[PDB]
């Protein structure tokens, strides 16, 4: 689905400075808009560049035994400065995400990391007569993130009873080491409602699985790292409530 | 009605005249009580005069 061939190595370093944050992207080109829709404003209180700056989650290590990783939005970003506050200080909140997953390795490492963004990704519990199941905390790992396995999501079933070989129906890009180091995903606000209760309902699910295994030349770095940088796009909330100071 | 955006406030003044500086302090209040007398008696204490230094 994501059959692209930018250049191969590196050309230009174009840095994305949004407010206080500053990422230096591999380039910037090769970006996939989810369903071809940009995050707009509800057609409220708009905290702009204050609540629209790059927060970077924990960098997880990809090793020969790694089965994968998965996060939840907004959830992950609930412990990030301003956006975190605006999440716990409102009853309403709609905000998009520019998930920019960067992965650096040498011209001696091989593998394929596919980033699948699943809308409303409920995780493993063939309990139709009852989803949610796994407690709020077991369902919300936050910034640290949860992991797939061969609170138990089965990787080949994308952790939801649907073969990963079909996962490609969701918006996604394959970071294939020999190609791009970067992967760009802009997910617009998708929900059954106009605006919603961010603390309860999880709008998105970034899941990074390993398509090809990692193989480093003879002896090198036993493991490489993958970084997730996310940023709230066109964020609005209604309406403050007793700046409930902690 | 029930609205919480983050504007400035909501509307413009709604009349505040009696809260103005001039009308805040425009109320006389006791400041002291000076006691005198006319003693035929030599009461060199109250002895007619009573002096008070003007202090709020």
UniProtKB/Swiss-Prot annotation, chain B:
User: Where would you find the membrane-spanning parts of this chain?
Assistant: none
Cellular localisation: Virion; Host cytoplasm
Superkingdom classification of source: Viruses
What is known about what this protein does?
Forms an icosahedral capsid of pseudo T=3 symmetry with capsid proteins VP2 and VP3. The capsid is 300 Angstroms in diameter, composed of 60 copies of each capsid protein and enclosing the viral positive strand RNA genome. Capsid protein VP1 mainly forms the vertices of the capsid. Capsid protein VP1 interacts with host cell receptor PVR to provide virion attachment to target host epithelial cells.
Q: How does it assemble?
A: Interacts with capsid protein VP0, and capsid protein VP3 to form heterotrimeric protomers. Five protomers subsequently associate to form pentamers which serve as building blocks for the capsid. Interacts with capsid protein VP2, capsid protein VP3 and capsid protein VP4 following cleavage of capsid protein VP0. Interacts with human PVR.
Instruction: Quote the protein name from its UniProt record.
Output: Capsid protein VP1
């Amino acid at each position: 689905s994501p059959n692209i061939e930018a250049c191969g190595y590196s050309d230009r370093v174009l840095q994305l400075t949004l407010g206080n944050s500053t990422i230096t992207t591999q380039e910037a080109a090769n970006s996939v808009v989810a369903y071809g829709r940009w995050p707009e404003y509800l057609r409220p209180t708009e905290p702009d560049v204050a609540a629209c700056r790059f927060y970077t989650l924990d960098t997880v290590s990809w090793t020969k035994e790694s089965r994968g990783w998965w996060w939840k939005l907004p959830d992950a970003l609930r412990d990030m400065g301003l956006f975190g506050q605006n999440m716990y200080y409102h009853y309403l909140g709609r905000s998009g995400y520019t998930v920019h997953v960067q992965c650096n390795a040498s011209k001696f490492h091989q593998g394929a990391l596919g980033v699948f963004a699943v809308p409303e990704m409920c995780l493993a519990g063939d309990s139709n007569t009852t989803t949610m199941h796994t407690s709020y905390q077991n369902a919300n790992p936050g910034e640290k993130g949860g992991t797939f396995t061969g609170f138990c999501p089965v990787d080949y079933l994308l952790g939801n009873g649907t073969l990963l070989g079909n996962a490609f129906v969701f918006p996604h890009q394959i970071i294939n080491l020999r190609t791009n180091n970067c992967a760009t995903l802009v997910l617009p606000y998708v929900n059954s409602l106009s605006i919603d209760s961010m603390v309860k309902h999880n709008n998105w699910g970034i899941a990074i699985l390993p398509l090809a295994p990692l193989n480093f030349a003879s002896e090198s770095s036993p493991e490489i790292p993958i970084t997730l940088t996310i940023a709230p796009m066109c964020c609005e909330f209604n309406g403050l409530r007793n700046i409930t100071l902690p | 009605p029930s609205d919480t955006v983050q504007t400035r406030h909501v509307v413009q003044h709604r009349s505040r005249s009696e809260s103005s500086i001039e009308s805040f302090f425009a109320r006389g209040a006791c400041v002291t009580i000076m006691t005198v007398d006319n003693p035929a008696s030599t009461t060199n204490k109250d002895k007619l005069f009573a002096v008070w230094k003007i202090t709020y």
